[PDB]
Paper text:
The enzyme that catalyses the addition of a single GlcNAc onto serine/threonine residues on intracellular proteins is O-GlcNAc transferase (OGT). OGT is highly conserved in metazoa, consisting of a C-terminal glycosyltransferase domain and N-terminal tetratricopeptide repeats (TPRs). In Drosophila, ogt is known as super sex combs (sxc), mutants of which do not develop beyond the pharate adult stage. sxc belongs to the Polycomb group (PcG) genes that play key roles in developmental regulation, stem-cell maintenance and genomic imprinting. Sequence similarity between hOGT and DmOGT is high, with 90% and approximately 80% sequence identity in the TPR region and the catalytic domain, respectively.
To determine how differences in sequence influence the overall structure of DmOGT and to provide a template for structure-guided mutagenesis, an N-terminally truncated construct starting at amino acid 353 in TPR 10 (Δ1–352) carrying a mutation (K872M) of a key catalytic lysine was expressed in Escherichia coli and crystallized in complex with the inhibitor/substrate analogue UDP-5S-GlcNAc. The structure was solved by molecular replacement and refined against 2.7 Å synchrotron diffraction data, yielding clear electron density for UDP-5S-GlcNAc. Crystals belonged to space group P32 and contained 3 molecules per asymmetric unit. It appears that DmOGT adopts the canonical OGT fold with the bilobal arrangement of two Rossmann-like domains characteristic of the GT-B superfamily of glycosyltransferases, as well as the additional TPR-like helices (535–566) in the N-terminal of the catalytic domain, which lead into the TPR domain. As a result, the TPRs are in close association with the glycosyltransferase domain and the catalytic site is aligned with the channel along the main axis of the TPR superhelix. The catalytic site residues (H537, H596, Y871, K872, K928, H932, R935, H951, D955) that are found to interact with UDP-GlcNAc and the acceptor peptides in hOGT are conserved and similarly positioned in DmOGT, suggesting a similar catalytic mechanism involving the same UDP-GlcNAc and acceptor peptide binding modes. The intervening domain, a 100-amino acid insertion between the two Rossmann-like folds of the catalytic domain, is the site of lowest sequence conservation and highest degree of flexibility in the structures of both hOGT and DmOGT. Three short loops were disordered, but the overall domain architecture mirrors that of the hOGT intervening domain. Activity of the Δ1–352 DmOGT is inhibited by UDP-5S-GlcNAc with an inhibition constant (Ki) of 36.2 µM, comparable with the Ki of Δ1–313 hOGT at 13.6 µM. The absence of a similar positively charged patch on the surface of DmOGT further weakens the hypothesis that PIP3 binding in general could regulate the subcellular localization of OGT.
Numbering used by the authors: 350 to 579, 582 to 750, 758 to 786, 789 to 828, 847 to 1059
The structure:
Amino acid sequence: GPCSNHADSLNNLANIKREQGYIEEATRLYLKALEVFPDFAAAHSNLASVLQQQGKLKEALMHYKEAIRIQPTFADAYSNMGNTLKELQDVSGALQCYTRAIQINPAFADAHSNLASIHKDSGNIPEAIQSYRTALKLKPDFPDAYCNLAHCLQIVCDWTDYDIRMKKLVSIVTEQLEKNRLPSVHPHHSMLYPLTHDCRKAIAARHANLCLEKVHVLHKKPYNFLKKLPGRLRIGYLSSDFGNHPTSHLMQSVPGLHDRSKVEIFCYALSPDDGTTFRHKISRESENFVDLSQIPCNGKAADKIFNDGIHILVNMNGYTKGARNEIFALRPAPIQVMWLGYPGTSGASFMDYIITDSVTSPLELAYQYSEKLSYMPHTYFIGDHKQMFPHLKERIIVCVDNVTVINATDLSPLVENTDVKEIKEVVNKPVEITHKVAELPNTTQIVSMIATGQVQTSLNGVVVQNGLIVITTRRQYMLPDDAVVYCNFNQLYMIDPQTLESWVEILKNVPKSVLWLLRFPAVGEQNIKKTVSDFGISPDRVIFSNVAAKEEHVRRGQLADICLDTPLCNGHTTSMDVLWTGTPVVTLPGETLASRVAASQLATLGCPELIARTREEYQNIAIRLGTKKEYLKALRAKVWKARVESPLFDCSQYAKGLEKLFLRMWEKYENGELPDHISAV
Ligand SMILES: CC(=O)N[C@@H]1[C@@H](O)[C@H](O)[C@@H](CO)S[C@@H]1OP(=O)(O)OP(=O)(O)OC[C@H]1O[C@@H](n2ccc(=O)[nH]c2=O)[C@H](O)[C@@H]1O
């Protein structure tokens, strides 16, 4: 009998200890309750969710099942089990638990919201939006549901009630911070919403504390460090993105370009081999390659790092998918650094330095960051473009440089069998520009090939491949030949109403102008048309193309006249892609790091004239460029020149800069010095 009443005392006592934040005590008391009365549903469930908090996901799962066995109609256990299964990468099982909770109780708001998260994670946004809507009809005061729904509406550019939604988001966060709860907005989404910098940093810090808490359970002693060095710094780059991922498209040449007499490089991969060349290249080029995806336990993973005797541990993930920040919370290296992958602060006590530059992160804005700033000599950004897209080093015009374009790794066959020549043109300053022009006055078979959807054609015995030796033409993407094409190739979530208003503003003032965007995702296309229409411009003047493979994408950009950056959150990589083809990008920097990346890139490129200071200047710079043919020609030439002359795409300069920064970090450590802001130059 009760007995079951004794089990009640302990369960509630464990509950009390859990409210106060004594997680170990609670666990022990829930265990004691189950030793006393094993068939106790509520206690299995409570123990499971405490076990889930501590990162013991496998054990939690065992006790949720015991709860559900004893009480089959325990909808709440099904729901939390679904979350544990989610965290364990088992999207399939999570889906069934949430389904089951809804079958038990169709009015269970959380289960609808949890389900919606699955849909959102899998890129199924319309379905996620229904489920979040459902959750909010059943429970209107549901911060988690509301903030995730808000994020889905960003992804799809649904801006209905935008201004009140943004304020409601800000209310919920500030409220949550004051009540000392973990907020409903993810630190990585932070940069989209009008939160104060202090707010964004607090969200970040709370995620960092989560990492410390999860890790406190291991009861490890702090690592003890080597204090003096006599030759080589051991640097460890830790990332889940070594493979086919934008991060490797930026940095893959860097490990192999490091001066091996100064530093020994270790690349720690957090994800499995995906068999791609990018993973192979980083594997070969890097002096040391370790795969930590084979070491699931964060405790052991930290140990391996400590055992490799690493001085500087570099976080390339921050709060992004695949991160294992618990490793950094264990402090397996005396100095720990954020670099490249996450455009924001960690807010973590266990991160010392962030790698940036003076444009991206001016000292005036240092309070944004928990980390001490460390300045690269020029921009903190890089790209492997010089190595990945050598065929895009220059273009060959066929017959204006952006209507029909040929690119090749080897131009021999074409130059040997057609009239290709390097004309000069003078443009009013007074500048001389060189073009390579292939003239064959037979547009027919080139247009005919595109018109019929042909894979290939042959100009005078030479095989030319349809870009959809390669040919790219405005027809391929439905762009008018005489149009002035403004482009942006970012995920649509980066666009807000103020951005779009400015773009319609420039389109209204530029005679034959068109806006080129991407179905990223497809379902956003409609919303953008509707709003454009509402702003007083024909929807037909905004042309959308499909998300393309990396090569086609960078190659397409050659057809744009001018690229327009998104001031809400700049296009970090795509803007590199576009610059590589010498297409100017006009930007307006804000205050967050993610707002200022393009400015940093352009500053390094030596083109500050493309960096606006107000919305008015942004629009005016873009209007002048679509309106003054000669000025546009001169600036595209300057951008083209700068792309090979400047450090922006120079991967070896970049390695040197990292080295100086790492040396400086060590010097401070070798002396008794606390981290403080440093610079390379
Ligand atoms: C705001 C933010 O979080 N930024 C992060 C940065 O701060 C980090 O520095 C980046 C590397 O760590 S990741 C991330 O950078 P982002 O620019 O947001 O890249 P994102 O993940 O949207 O995809 C663009 C890719 O799709 C390719 N792309 C694009 C269009 C197309 O048609 N085809 C195509 O292959 C493009 O060539 C690109 O390769």
